[PDB]
Amino acid sequence: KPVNLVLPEVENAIFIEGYPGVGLVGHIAANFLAKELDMDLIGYVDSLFIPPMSLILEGRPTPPLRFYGKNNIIIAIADIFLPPTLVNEIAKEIVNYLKKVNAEKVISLAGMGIGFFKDTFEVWGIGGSEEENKELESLGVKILKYGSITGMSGKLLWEASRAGLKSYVLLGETFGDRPDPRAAANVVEVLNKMLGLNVSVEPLLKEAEMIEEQLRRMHEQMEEARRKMERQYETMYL
Amino acid sequence: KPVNLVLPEVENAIFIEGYPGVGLVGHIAANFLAKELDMDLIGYVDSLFIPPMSLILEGRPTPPLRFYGKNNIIIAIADIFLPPTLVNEIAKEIVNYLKKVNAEKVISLAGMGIGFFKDTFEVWGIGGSEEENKELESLGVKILKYGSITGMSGKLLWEASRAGLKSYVLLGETFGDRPDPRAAANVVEVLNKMLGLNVSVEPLLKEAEMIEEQLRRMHEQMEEARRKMERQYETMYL
Amino acid sequence: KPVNLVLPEVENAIFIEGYPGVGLVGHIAANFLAKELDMDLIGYVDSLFIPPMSLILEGRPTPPLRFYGKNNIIIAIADIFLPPTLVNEIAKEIVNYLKKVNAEKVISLAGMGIGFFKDTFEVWGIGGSEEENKELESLGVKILKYGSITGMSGKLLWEASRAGLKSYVLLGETFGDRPDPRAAANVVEVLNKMLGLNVSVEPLLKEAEMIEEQLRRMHEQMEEARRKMERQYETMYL
Amino acid sequence: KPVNLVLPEVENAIFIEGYPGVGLVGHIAANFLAKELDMDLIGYVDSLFIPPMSLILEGRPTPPLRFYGKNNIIIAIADIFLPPTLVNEIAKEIVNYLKKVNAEKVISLAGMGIGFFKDTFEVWGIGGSEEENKELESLGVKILKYGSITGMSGKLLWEASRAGLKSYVLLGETFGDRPDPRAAANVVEVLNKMLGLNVSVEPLLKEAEMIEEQLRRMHEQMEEARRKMERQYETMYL
Amino acid sequence: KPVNLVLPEVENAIFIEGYPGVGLVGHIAANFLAKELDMDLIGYVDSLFIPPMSLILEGRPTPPLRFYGKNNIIIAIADIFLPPTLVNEIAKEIVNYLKKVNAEKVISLAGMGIGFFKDTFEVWGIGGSEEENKELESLGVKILKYGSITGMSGKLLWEASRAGLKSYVLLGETFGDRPDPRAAANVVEVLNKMLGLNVSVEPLLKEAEMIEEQLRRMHEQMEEARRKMERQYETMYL
Ligand SMILES: [Cl-]
Ligand SMILES: [Cl-]
Ligand SMILES: [Cl-]
Ligand SMILES: [Cl-]
Ligand SMILES: [Cl-]
Ligand SMILES: [Cl-]
Ligand SMILES: [Cl-]
Ligand SMILES: [Cl-]
């Protein structure tokens, strides 16, 4: 067997997947939820085809593909992109596990790279069947009419619905070229409504401001430093 | 088994295949027929070697290789190019299914990239045996004397005929560098005669005009906008 | 099993192979013989690793690797280059078949890319053993002393001789950069002497003249057309 | 199987691994310890996927992946980088061996590429569990809070701890672009404290000085030589 | 099984291997010995992963990897480089054969690419164990202290010694960028002393002179020809 899921059964699990993707939208959202709900590391994906590494998080070695849990919610995180065939093999194992445990919901978190000059960033959605499309509509999420969703999200959407599970994908609009905690927040907001979780997305919006403030400040200091050096060169040498 | 066909039996099926190819001729033709005959999604190809995705069509997740049906006609569609060995594996499974169900006809839809400065775009044809060549001649389709037909179309032509099925390929002449709904229409016209379907190719010809009108109009507005900006720069700054 | 030879037994077969190669010498020679001896398509090579296609010849679908026959002569043709390991696998199956049927002769047709400024184009030869070298000498074919022969020809030469079959390769000298029906003719001439076939190589030499006449004429008309356009531009605009 | 560990059992082994990596920090450290503790070559990794070579050390042929030993300490050395899947396969076999022999400690030596203009080069650490983190803290090694450790080190850290073994990684800060015996020395110092070995890191610090002195001296002589040649050209030819 | 050695048993064989490598030193040496000792072609390596070809030597088809013999000495020759894993597989089969027949010596011939401006070209050596190092010392061959020997030579050295066979590598220093019959001669001289063969290396040194004389002469005639053409252009056209 190329891929082994090492993951305890969690009956009627709500499974949320945020693999790396455009904007890191899914990934930031999933990681934020795992943190804010004080989830434990409950399992991981094991395969010879996952390249050798340990991530170190709060001084604990963790594998690159892992599962976090707090009673009934599982969150699936990855820190690497993976080749297509391996993704498919992992998706197979995940869907087997979700059938086994009669998972209540299968939710994939994703990003949609969508220009620069858009006023507000929406969250789009798609459901396994018309029933799930209706649910998403009733949380005021725009349903995606035409498109493609590649990667784990796209495969889970199809595979999980085909196995009779209620499956969804949320796609936060983002620039498409950078980590975007704001778009992740939009997605986490939709997830609050969907699951009644009441997690504040403030720390996420704070994080975004602090990054942008830091960038502005570093650019200021860089340019101020070269202007000082030019003025200094001229007074010394003209 | 590398490829699983998930497809109910349709006795004495007329199987039509329009995989992506030059001009998207086959693909547009097949997709148009599926739509205009209000076909249902009846099946799909499943394989670890098909890269992970869902297509979203009218807000429903669908796999990239799928089958549409309406009583006795099956239409095979793909939204991705596929590597040669996988194509061969899919062809094997398709031909097995068509033997099983005693398919009446196996028709591949394709394009022939053929210059720019040709007055009219023809439709060529080829049959599994001289019997099918004769049929195509009697619908005034030119028989291809010398050529190669690569991809699924070429393989099905040979494999299906070798298994005792009546097999054909229709090739719409096209530019060779762009989606061509007009050439698809030519092919759909030939398919009407062949199967007595009376599907209007008007919406297809309309679609082509609207695309071209839109392009012309956007190019007009683009060029008019830069001329305005030049005039504006000059009045402001000369 | 990666490669299946679908080929009826032909006792004491004279097997001639002309796979694509420098100059298309082998290939043109083999194809010409098959045509001029009104051979039938008697079989083919079947493998998932042969890329999907049908060639269309005289309006009949044929596979890319095929066998032509007329009582006791088999001619093996291919329309594609193939990767080394697959070539070896095909060679194995071919040699098994030739042992089975006690083949009388195993002849590979090939080209030798050899400069531009040579007056005459020779045909070289090599035999499985000194006995076959002697035969070739007695038809005034130069024996190749040192060299390598890659591809199917080289493998068959060795494998067929090692299985106790009389094996040969004929190599028509050619430019090395273009289809050369003249060099093919040289090879077919040697094959006439070797097998007493009396096939005229005139149509081949005719074909070469007509191609060269067409090229000269097109180049004339091209250059005459731009001279006319220059004269026309000058009279219009000076 | 694809990888065979040829290695005698050493009960309750202290296993130290220094595979090549940034700075050659791990590698230099491990190699130095093996030498200074007069270890014997006790085993090696054998695999068809290890490229064919012998290293020659003190006139003895040795394989590229080898194990050195002196009563209870095993040191694992490699002289080549290896592809990820092979690394994982080797890690599997190593961890199996370490379970078998109830290894006391599993220590990976590594480097951390970390800029140029840093005052001191530290040594960081990480442990399989909080118990080992505590040990490292009590030798005044900074515990790594966040990061990733790729390669054999990262995999062993996780795999060995998951099999109930006490596992650690030491990471010497280094420039990141060159062999760094100084950083290796820092790591060997930490290893002395951890295992009570009292190995002098002087020869290592000496080695670093001699390399740097040699570089400076060669650059001096090069530049002095071209200045002499310029002066000589001018006196000869002006 | 990927590689079959077709090679009669030769009890207590002296096995000499000269696979292509830097300078073609090994290869020229091995080939020269096979010729000068009037060896017969006794066997070959057979594998689907050896690319299809025949070499033609004195008008006989031979495989690219072959074995020459004269009572008790086997010489292994290859005319192609091979991928690492295949080399390892061939080495496995060779060492199995050498255990089977209780081979007396396993000698690899190789080159060491080593600059341009060296007065004399030495021959270095290395032995499987200290016993063989001593033998080589007693024929005044310098023992290599540190280095790596890649390819078949390196693998045989290790594998054959690990199977209890007496194994050696001789490395002729050479430029590193061209066929070097002189360095091959140096190696053949050492092989004479080692095995008491008294083969004159004169024809080899003669061959080198004739090549160099030919090069000088061709370069002379080339340059003399363009000078003549310049003089001729000037007298015609000034
Ligand atoms: Cl990341
Ligand atoms: Cl200045
Ligand atoms: Cl498309
Ligand atoms: Cl201006
Ligand atoms: Cl061709
Ligand atoms: Cl190294
Ligand atoms: Cl001067
Ligand atoms: Cl060579």
UniProtKB/TrEMBL annotation, chains A, B, C, D, E:
Transmembrane segments: none
Keyword list, A-Z: Coiled coil
Coiled coil (UniProt feature): 205-235
One protein family per Pfam: PAC2
InterPro entries: MJ0106-like (IPR004425), Proteasome_assmbl_chaperone_2 (IPR019151), PSMG2_sf (IPR038389)
Gene3D superfamilies: PAC-like subunit
Protein name: Proteasome assembly chaperone family protein
